[PDB]
Structure 1
Amino acid sequence: VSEQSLNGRWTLKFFPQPAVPVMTIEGAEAANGIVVDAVVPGNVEIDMEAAGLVEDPMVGNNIYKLRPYEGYQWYYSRTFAAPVVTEGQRLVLHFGGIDTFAEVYVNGIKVGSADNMLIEHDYDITSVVKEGENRLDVIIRSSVMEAQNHFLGTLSIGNFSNEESAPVRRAPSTYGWDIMPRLVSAGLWRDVTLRVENPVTIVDANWVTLSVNPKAREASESLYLQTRLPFEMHDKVKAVITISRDGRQILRKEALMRKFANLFTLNLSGVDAWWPRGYGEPALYTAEVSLVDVTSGKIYDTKTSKIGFRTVKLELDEVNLPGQPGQFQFIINGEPVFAKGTNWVPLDALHSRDASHVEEAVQLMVEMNCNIVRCWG
């Protein structure tokens, strides 16, 4: 129905982590720490430099001066107006990125516990949200100290990746590499939003290119659609599939929703294939699917994404060193492409600034004419 954003100014209170880490709001407020203004999405080091508490780590040996903060806790807090929810609607609190181990409270009620900085986190706060001003509190603990909650196997010690990185789900380069500095950091480094979902909603729209014929401008595309559908809405809701490019509608298919999960296959004509750089055009088509009430015409949900009709196959060599690394070739749309490109390292040691560099960084590959890029583990 809507997506209210919770980005902006938050309250950040940081303090050294005690022997028993702080998990509750009472302990976080009782702890003796410093309170400064914070920006979400952001990194805690950015908020402290804005407060004049840390020097610029990009200059000289200032990076080492952030060392004590690896054992600090970080208490994000803000208020928010609750969006309007009607009966059957669900209120979801969405985190694009929590770095890392945090307890999330809404109006003093714990709604989740995060432990992976690389994936999104969604919590159903429908039953805990209140009318009017609400409170949202996130209490992050030390990622480095979290490693001492595990016993490492022999093979996990002594590698180039830090031992602290082995038992936790974080970016290994944040602990230090030969190309990226050590800067564990913390904070809400991606968007925080409030989402309202109708009882009839799209759970997943999976687009799959079954086959492609670039010469005949044909393609067979599959849509694996999973939805949330109350049984009173079975046979009363229809799926509206729409393929278009540059405003011109290529296909509009309608089908009655009789199940919650369906597979739709579309045999398309006059459609171009997606090619990497040099081997043709990167033809993209707008693929939209909406759940519409058959009687009232109400649109309950709409999922839109730009897809490309393309097939990928990895032809492995069977003579010259069969099974050894590098003995393969990518087969795109049946053609053996020659890959030329770069390795993708972190865009910023403070990863909340990543999104601000993607445009410039991708444009480097466009000028370089890379047809491939490997996002480094």
Structure 2
Amino acid sequence: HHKLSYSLSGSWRVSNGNGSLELPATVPGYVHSALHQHGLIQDPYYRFNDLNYRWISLDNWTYSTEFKIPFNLSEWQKVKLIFDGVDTVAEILFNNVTIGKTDNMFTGYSFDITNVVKDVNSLKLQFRSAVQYAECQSKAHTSYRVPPECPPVEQKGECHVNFIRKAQCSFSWDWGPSFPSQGIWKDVRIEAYNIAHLDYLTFLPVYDNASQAWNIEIKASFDVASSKSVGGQVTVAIPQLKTQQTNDIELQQEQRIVKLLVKIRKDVAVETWWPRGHGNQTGYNMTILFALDGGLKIEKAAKVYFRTVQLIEEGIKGSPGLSFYFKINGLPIFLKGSNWIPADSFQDKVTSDRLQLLFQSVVDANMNTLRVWGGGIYEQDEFYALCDELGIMVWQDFMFASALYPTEPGFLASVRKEVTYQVRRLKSHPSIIIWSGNNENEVALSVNWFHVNPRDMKTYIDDYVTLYVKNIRKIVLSEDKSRPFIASSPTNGMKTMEEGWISYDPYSIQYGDIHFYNYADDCWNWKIFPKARLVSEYGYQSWPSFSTLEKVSSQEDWAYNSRFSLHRQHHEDGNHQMLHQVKMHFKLPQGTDPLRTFKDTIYLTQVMQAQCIKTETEFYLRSRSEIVDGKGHTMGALYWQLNDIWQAPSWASLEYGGKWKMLHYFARRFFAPLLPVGFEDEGVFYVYGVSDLHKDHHTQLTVRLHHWSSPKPLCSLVNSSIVVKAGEAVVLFQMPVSELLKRCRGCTRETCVVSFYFSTDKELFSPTNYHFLSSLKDAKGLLEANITVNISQKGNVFVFDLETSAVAPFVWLDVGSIPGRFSDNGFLMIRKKLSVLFYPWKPTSKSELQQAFSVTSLTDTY
């Protein structure tokens, strides 16, 4: 009865520095999106507007609103103004009184406005340019430089992002633009109360190996209205666990924290939470009721999920060092997923509908893990709710990435609030399986990426320990010991800590995790890849589809090396690197029409990307059970990257807008729970079996060769004594290449293709796989394919019946910007006739699909 809360989200005003511009502005919102919405600017993502609209990011904008409170001041002891998120630096004026300032995008702010609030009020947030602010802070830091000061020229970005607590990629990245905007990016509320006010509540389900029982630690902080002592009770209730518990509490200005420990009666069984493909995502409804002196009731509901996570760094026989793998509820689980980056330059456009769609694509790719990479944001509430409900594990970076950071007291003060706020906000989600202090900054110092003078290295080392160990780690462990903490990615884990927090070689495959990139060598040669304990990053670049590019480009831009394309490419020499890897096994597009060449080159970079990451992922998949030359037991593959922040060449499998690249289709296939993977070593074709299943599985391995001439198997080897143990990888086939060809007369490396598959239940997804005996640019007898398609509707799905004149590799179906994705794409089409489905994301029609449809195969490019 003594509490009142309502949102100030809605229609505000926004105005620029000198007041010339003034327009309506939605909150939550950003200046750029307000200007675009009001028709005052073009789409910022159009062509070169990241350069043309620089002035927006450099001015100082003010968000203003006038409102009439819906309550009587004289009836309330205290009134507060609460911000869930402000981006980033702003002075806050309430009725022309400065009530506070902000400097951190990732922390909530609370301001007492009891003495300044009136019946009619004016609220102004006077933002400061993030770019200008970051530069001034860099200047003030005279005692020494903090690198990197400016980004590479090919990123077309802004300097000194490490000096502002804001999304570190907002000043540009090697796949993202520089639109460092200003805005109120989360909800704003007025909250009045008597007696007490719940500042925050956090909880943590833990398992006591001692008691063999489940508990829930709860912590709540209150702001008490007066100097008197508030009493009351608290009842925590979980009905579906026959659990209920009531305790006495008392609150005072200097004793404002409540701590409870609810024990779950062992009489009842507690179903645990599991990642997708390894169990149920079951949780339990919970309520927390505060009944305080004077009729004040404060209830909070939450969903409780019970699961245990262990980072196991144990010894391995014959493999020097330590393992690095995750046990969920005691079961070792191979991490399968990708790295998540911000889905937009402006967070107000990452709607619930976009997110749910993106998580459907993550699910349909047979992923169970996402890394929230530390150059993005601490993600919005619904991200982690979706992870919990769908069973996606989260590798959670803190928002520090590929940079050194100051330890000036004001900055550290800012960081402490942020980390404290976010850990309390996030620690109750079962999806989060590990805390990670930063991205790649242990490497940056160990290798001296920024070429610091070895005379000043000690300064930066101490700054590193100060930030990630003495502040971030200390805060995390003081809140949460249910999860492992690493200081950086990649790291050597316990070995890094032993070595003083900056390892001698953080890229060691004998400890911790690694990131691995390589653009020079043949991606088909799996020997280039490290047989590491866990691969948290690895990627190849490709261009997004023409449909995605068309929306932010014009006719004259549609060439691989046009001014526009080189502008969007933010990775040093990425266009050449991508072609270099294409040439490795494919013919470059030869054609007369430049637009056709443009589209065909895109297709080939997505072909190169998909096949490269397929080869690389499968290598990690097969290395999970074996040791070879003292290396192995790979227990995770998270490729860089899942998604795009805008239309540009990147490592993503999901183009900006959600459209699947060919990589994503390959991802759905190589992340299956049961998979045969083929490769060669010194002239011997091998086939391992890979299992994520919990029971040993017995199946039948068929192997076949096919001449490019027609889909007739020149042989059919069928071992039916196949057993893959639970969650393991094991060699199931082995033969010389000469012996393999002779047993299939009429086959050359340059004329035949290998194919293999298991025979599965209809309740188990184990797709076809294949292997190429030579570069396709050298394939002989490759008949020119001529594929015919008949489109039809069946319920909410559309059916695509195909027919090919020849064995067509990398058949690619494309319906432009029609929102949706196919049941399968980019596949090797041995058969003559196949059928795939199309899943629309908005209502479409067979006519629309026919008009936009196009099919491509490898031979169409030369």
Match of 1:124 in 2: 112
CA apart distance, 1:204: 3.7
Indicate whether 1:255 and 2:247 are aligned: yes
The counterpart of 2:133, out of the listed 146, 150, 164, is 146
Alpha-carbon separation, structure 2, partners of 1:32 and 1:79: 17
CA deviation map 1:134-158 (0-9, x unaligned): 1101111111011222236254336
Alpha-carbon separation, structure 2, partners of 1:239 and 1:165: 45
Indicate whether 1:79 and 2:66 are aligned: yes
The counterpart of 1:373, out of the listed 366, 370, 375, is 370
Which residues of 2 match residues 171-186 of structure 1 at below 5 A? 171-186=167-182
Match of 2:12 in 1: 10
Which residues of 2 match residues 12-161 of structure 1 at below 5 A? 12-15=14-17, 31-84=18-71, 89-130=77-118, 132-149=119-136, 150=138, 151=141, 153=145, 155-157=147-149
The SS at the match of 1:63 is helix
CA deviation map 1:303-353 (0-9, x unaligned): 222121112121124454537xxx511121122121111211111111121
Alpha-carbon separation, structure 2, partners of 1:158 and 1:126: 44
Alpha-carbon separation, structure 1, partners of 2:205 and 2:9: 36
Alpha-carbon separation, structure 1, partners of 2:122 and 2:358: 37
Alpha-carbon separation, structure 1, partners of 2:69 and 2:122: 10
Match of 1:267 in 2: 264
Match of 2:746 in 1: none
Structure 1 counterpart of 2:91, one-letter code: E
Structure 1 counterpart of 2:243, one-letter code: L
Match of 1:344 in 2: 340
Q: List runs of 5+ in structure 2 lacking aligned partners.
A: 375-862
CA apart distance, 1:185: 1.3
> Matched residue pairs, number?
349
- Conserved? CA contact 2:149–2:160, under 8 Å: no
CA deviation map 1:167-202 (0-9, x unaligned): 111111111112221111111122122123442343
Q: TM-score, normalised by structure 2?
A: 0.38
Alpha-carbon separation, structure 2, partners of 1:270 and 1:348: 43
Q: List runs of 5+ in structure 1 lacking aligned partners.
A: 16-30
The counterpart of 1:362, out of the listed 356, 359, 363, is 359
CA deviation map 1:92-125 (0-9, x unaligned): 2122221111110111111110111122222111
CA gap 1:163/1:120 in 2 versus in 1, 3 angstroms: same
Indicate whether 1:285 and 2:284 are aligned: yes
CA gap 1:167/1:302 in 2 versus in 1, 3 angstroms: same
- Conserved? CA contact 2:135–2:159, under 8 Å: no
* Farther-moved stretch of structure 1 (284-293 vs 220-229): 220-229
The SS at the match of 1:288 is strand
CA gap 1:222/1:176 in 2 versus in 1, 3 angstroms: same
Alpha-carbon separation, structure 1, partners of 2:117 and 2:349: 31
Q: Which has the larger radius of gyration?
A: 2
The SS at the match of 2:16 is strand
The SS at the match of 1:57 is coil
- Conserved? CA contact 1:212–1:309, under 8 Å: no
- Conserved? CA contact 1:102–1:141, under 8 Å: yes
- Conserved? CA contact 2:309–2:328, under 8 Å: yes
CA deviation map 1:255-310 (0-9, x unaligned): 1214652332312423211111122111111222111147x6x3431222212111
The SS at the match of 1:301 is strand
Q: Please identify which structure carries the higher helix content.
A: 2
Indicate whether 1:164 and 2:160 are aligned: yes
Q: Percent identity?
A: 28
Match of 1:27 in 2: none
- Conserved? CA contact 2:148–2:160, under 8 Å: no
Structure 2 counterpart of 1:240, one-letter code: T
CA apart distance, 1:211: 1.0
Match of 2:216 in 1: 221
The counterpart of 2:186, out of the listed 190, 201, 208, is 190
CA apart distance, 1:90: 2.8
CA deviation map 1:25-49 (0-9, x unaligned): xxxxxx3421111111111111112
Q: Which has the higher contact order (CA 8 A, sep 6+)?
A: 1
CA gap 1:32/1:159 in 2 versus in 1, 3 angstroms: closer
Alpha-carbon separation, structure 2, partners of 1:54 and 1:321: 59
